[PDB]
Design an enzyme around this catalytic site. Structure first.
Site, PDB file in Angstrom:
ATOM      1  N   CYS A 204     -17.645 -19.716  18.256  1.00  0.00           N
ATOM      2  CA  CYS A 204     -18.455 -18.924  19.168  1.00  0.00           C
ATOM      3  C   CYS A 204     -18.693 -19.679  20.475  1.00  0.00           C
ATOM      4  CB  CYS A 204     -19.781 -18.533  18.514  1.00  0.00           C
ATOM      5  SG  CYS A 204     -21.176 -19.705  18.735  1.00  0.00           S
TER       6      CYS A 204
ATOM      7  N   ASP B  96     -25.848  -4.819   5.623  1.00  0.00           N
ATOM      8  CA  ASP B  96     -26.795  -5.005   6.711  1.00  0.00           C
ATOM      9  C   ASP B  96     -27.704  -6.162   6.319  1.00  0.00           C
ATOM     10  OD1 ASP B  96     -29.723  -4.372   6.007  1.00  0.00           O
ATOM     11  OD2 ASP B  96     -28.615  -2.798   4.965  1.00  0.00           O
TER      12      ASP B  96
HETATM   13  C1  LIG Z   1     -32.881  -1.718  10.841  1.00  0.00           C
HETATM   14  C2  LIG Z   1     -32.724  -1.595   9.346  1.00  0.00           C
HETATM   15  C3  LIG Z   1     -32.046  -2.558   8.617  1.00  0.00           C
HETATM   16  C4  LIG Z   1     -31.854  -2.421   7.253  1.00  0.00           C
HETATM   17  C5  LIG Z   1     -32.338  -1.317   6.573  1.00  0.00           C
HETATM   18  C6  LIG Z   1     -32.107  -1.163   5.088  1.00  0.00           C
HETATM   19  C7  LIG Z   1     -33.416  -0.825   4.327  1.00  0.00           C
HETATM   20  C8  LIG Z   1     -33.272  -0.874   2.820  1.00  0.00           C
HETATM   21  C9  LIG Z   1     -33.440  -2.091   2.147  1.00  0.00           C
HETATM   22  N1  LIG Z   1     -33.713  -3.363   2.599  1.00  0.00           N
HETATM   23  C10 LIG Z   1     -33.816  -4.140   1.499  1.00  0.00           C
HETATM   24  N2  LIG Z   1     -33.621  -3.494   0.367  1.00  0.00           N
HETATM   25  C11 LIG Z   1     -33.397  -2.174   0.750  1.00  0.00           C
HETATM   26  C12 LIG Z   1     -33.202  -1.030  -0.027  1.00  0.00           C
HETATM   27  C13 LIG Z   1     -33.074   0.196   0.629  1.00  0.00           C
HETATM   28  C14 LIG Z   1     -33.053   1.440  -0.155  1.00  0.00           C
HETATM   29  O1  LIG Z   1     -33.071   1.488  -1.386  1.00  0.00           O
HETATM   30  N3  LIG Z   1     -33.023   2.581   0.599  1.00  0.00           N
HETATM   31  C15 LIG Z   1     -32.985   2.603   1.972  1.00  0.00           C
HETATM   32  N4  LIG Z   1     -32.900   3.803   2.559  1.00  0.00           N
HETATM   33  N5  LIG Z   1     -33.011   1.499   2.720  1.00  0.00           N
HETATM   34  C16 LIG Z   1     -33.082   0.270   2.032  1.00  0.00           C
HETATM   35  C17 LIG Z   1     -33.043  -0.364   7.296  1.00  0.00           C
HETATM   36  C18 LIG Z   1     -33.228  -0.503   8.659  1.00  0.00           C
HETATM   37 ZN   LIG Z   2     -21.321 -21.066  16.842  1.00  0.00          ZN
END
Ligand SMILES: Cc1ccc(CCc2c3nc[nH]c3cc3c(=O)[nH]c(N)nc23)cc1
Ligand SMILES: [Zn+2]
Ligand SMILES: Cc1ccc(CCc2c3nc[nH]c3cc3c(=O)[nH]c(N)nc23)cc1
Ligand SMILES: [Zn+2]
EC number: 2.4.2.29
Lengths: 355, 355
Positions: A292, A252
């Site tokens: 795209c 993500d």
């Molecule tokens: C909409 C959305 C997008 C992405 C996320 C992921 C958010 C995210 C982290 N983001 C950067 N480093 C991260 C580490 C962790 C983590 O250790 N634990 C959890 N539960 N989420 C993480 C949450 C919500």
């Molecule tokens: Zn493009």
């Protein structure tokens, strides 16, 4: 009929692998990029923290669940909410969960799983603590130990909800900061509980790429090989390529959407800031090879014009291109692993992206 | 091969008419709504005033003209720029033109026509003065007389540019404020010069609908019947319906795009403010009958959610729906005139839009 959850690996090269996750609502090709739903992709992200507050999880359930609400009938992944609470909310932490502030709210393993149930997501994250960075060995250990107790509570809450246990999947999240022994203990604890997939948490928290890759080097092999591996919060295209080289299957990242609303476009020759005057007369598409619809039809000069004029169309076109670029990146990664030329792809990718 | 310009009336009901304008780049069905290009439509609006300044008309010409720049190969209408200069720019007015302020700029009939030539638009507006409202008879007359001298200068400049004279069309703009005798003198002057179409200028300047309709009642019959009639700057759906009832064939208006970026959606039951809490659980589409892709797929509740969250997707969906609503409005107007039931349509439209 597809199963609730089945991960199959079709090809490997080094630590990299490519395959599919089958779920009731669709197939997810891996390695996968999972864009935010409110921004082609096989799965999108819901925003548990935001939805908890507006309109509320109960209200989403009253409206028919997130799939109906968003108009997306394919898989949805939701995070467990504590990462966002700790980054965005006053907060009070305890063994029970986290309280935070209109009025106050508690978030516990049980409440997080119930919220994700009410939202109706297909991949549910355990409720964990993302340890701040840097952390001392003692604090990283104490934090990881709490997360593992919470992982067991998350497992039990998920299993208690028949509709959720039978139709969704639950991922455990490894913690332990940058410390090999704690990462091992966390992996061991998660495997003893048993999950459908395993995330590497606690990274993309300011450690930098060299350190992130170093931790991935020893951390990903600790997870079960036959289950998907999700690196949370990552990342730039070059982070993705290196994480796939180290055994990650799912990603993500805010960047495609954040960048698309802030003037930055991703290209095979690196990111460009389309507002810069050097693009005012550039008749080439955002990227010379991108397939795209934006790059089929419009120039850098026109998108520059729209963004400089404050036109919504500009940000929309940038965002469409960026998410499309990420999906082309993942397709090229999957194809190169399946063809046994991923190592060459990664070297070629880097030489060009950074030239 | 289509002609440079040919207006044909296919059906009439009262003062209302429906037909087509044929131009080299396409057919325009009338009555027509002409949306901004940077926001289905047969013609879009370019923004002369903005383009003059960024990147500049010369630069647009260097990039291949506005059609290539925007990726739109169908007709484009451009305004002459003085309305926008006088509303948005320090300004100095003289018989030669208007100077205004980086550095300073002059805009004259000759320069306005040349800018519109460099942009490559298909329908070119004469360079006029939009008289402020209210205006005394003396000031309205002096202003209108200058605009008519400028209309002749615009005609001559257009005719001097072979590529423009042979491939584009030129519209004259009637002025005279709210005064019947001055509107008549202006119409007479414009017809003596001769134009491809005739616009009613000087309205949508704060006079209100009753007064606008009153002026249209006597002003539109003064224009040549066999040429298109363009009411500049109008308007709300109810303004459009009443102006068609009074003989107008063409419309521009910021409202669809302005409203789409500011939380307002147009529906057959009137405008709604989608941010209002009453829509947070409303599972109906923006409009119950609209055929647009937004209303086929998403609810008021979801669009409300996106807009309240500050998501770009929300404004984009609102704007797509609004422009689509306007085109459905124009299609229903054209069909009802062609079928001889426009008078009934207008009564039914009003009863429902204002209920
Ligand atoms: C909409 C959305 C997008 C992405 C996320 C992921 C958010 C995210 C982290 N983001 C950067 N480093 C991260 C580490 C962790 C983590 O250790 N634990 C959890 N539960 N989420 C993480 C949450 C919500
Ligand atoms: Zn493009
Ligand atoms: C992008 C764009 C959209 C619309 C217009 C039309 C702007 C416009 C008016 N708007 C409200 N009332 C108006 C009156 C006149 C007028 O008398 N003369 C001219 N040349 N334009 C008008 C110009 C540019
Ligand atoms: Zn619609």
């Amino acid at each position: 009929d597809r199963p609730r959850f089945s991960f199959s690996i079709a090809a490997r090269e080094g630590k990299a692998r490519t395959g599919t996750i089958e779920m009731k609502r669709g197939v997810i090709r891996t390695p996968a990029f999972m864009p935010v739903g409110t921004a082609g992709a096989d799965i999108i992200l819901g925003n548990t923290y935001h939805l908890m507050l507006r309109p509320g999880a109960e209200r989403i359930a009253k409206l028919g669940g997130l799939h109906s609400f968003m108009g997306w009938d394919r898989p949805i992944l939701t995070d467990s909410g504590g990462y966002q609470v700790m980054s965005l909310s006053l907060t009070k932490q305890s063994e029970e969960g986290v309280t935070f502030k209109g009025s106050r709210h508690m978030l516990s393993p049980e409440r997080s799983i119930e919220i994700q149930h009410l939202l109706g997501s297909d991949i549910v994250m355990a409720f964990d603590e993302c340890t701040p960075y840097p952390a001392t060995p003692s604090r990283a250990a104490s934090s990881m130990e709490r997360s593992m107790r919470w992982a067991k509570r998350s497992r039990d809450a998920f299993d208690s909800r028949k509709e959720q246990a039978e139709n969704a999947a639950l991922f455990g999240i490894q913690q332990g900061s940058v410390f090999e022994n704690l990462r091992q203990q966390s992996a061991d604890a998660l495997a003893e509980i048993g999950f459908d997939g395993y995330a590497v948490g606690g990274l993309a928290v300011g450690e930098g790429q060299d350190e992130m890759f170093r931790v991935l080097d020893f951390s990903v092999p600790m997870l079960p090989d036959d289950k998907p591996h999700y690196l949370m919060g990552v990342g730039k295209p070059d982070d993705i390529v290196g994480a796939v080289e180290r055994g990650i299957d799912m990603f993500d990242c805010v960047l495609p959407t954040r960048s698309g609303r802030n003037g930055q476009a991703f290209t095979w020759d690196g990111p460009i800031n389309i507002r810069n005057a050097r693009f005012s007369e550039d008749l080439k598409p955002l990227d010379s090879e991108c397939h795209c619809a934006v790059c089929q039809k419009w120039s850098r000069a026109y998108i520059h014009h729209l963004i400089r004029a404050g036109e919504i169309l500009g940000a929309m076109l940038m965002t469409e291109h960026n998410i499309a670029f990420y999906q082309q990146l993942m397709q090229k990664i999957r194809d190169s692993i399946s063809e046994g030329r991923f190592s060459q792809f990664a070297q070629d990718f880097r030489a060009r992206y950074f030239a």
